């Protein structure tokens, strides 16, 4: 119906949930530096040279906050070379 949203949510396949934090992290990334341009990403892109650090680290950990639940790790944004492990991090928090 629609209150069914969340079971669809935790309802999604792994794929679908992985390829689905991914584009958000993607975007979610991008915007940390604050633009919405996902040609500047790739999934598999340098974090680093994106430009993370720990402010804009956390400003993305904060959003990613409302693609998790949690609040991620501090080192999300150290021990991930790039998005692709993001969704993992995140994939593994929210399994």
């Known amino acids: 119906g629609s209150h069914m949203l969340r079971d669809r949510l935790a309802g999604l396949p792994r794929a679908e949930r992985?390829?689905?934090l991914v584009r958000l992290?993607?975007?979610?990334?991008?915007?940390?530096?604050?633009?919405?341009?996902?040609k500047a990403v790739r999934a598999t892109t340098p974090f680093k040279e994106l430009g993370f650090?720990?402010?804009?680290?956390?400003?993305?950990r904060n959003l990613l906050n409302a693609a998790?639940?949690?609040?991620?790790?501090?080192?999300?944004v150290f021990d991930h070379p790039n998005a692709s492990a993001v969704a993992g991090f995140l994939d593994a928090e929210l399994g």
């Not at 992290?25 to 996902?38: K, M, N, Q, W």
């Not at 998790?68 to 999300?76: C, I, K, N, V, Y």
């Open 68 to 76: 998790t639940g949690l609040r991620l790790p501090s080192t999300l």
């Open 53 to 60: 650090d720990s402010l804009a680290a956390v400003r993305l």
């Open 25 to 38: 992290v993607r975007t979610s990334t991008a915007t940390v530096l604050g633009h919405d341009d996902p």
């Open 18 to 20: 992985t390829a689905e």
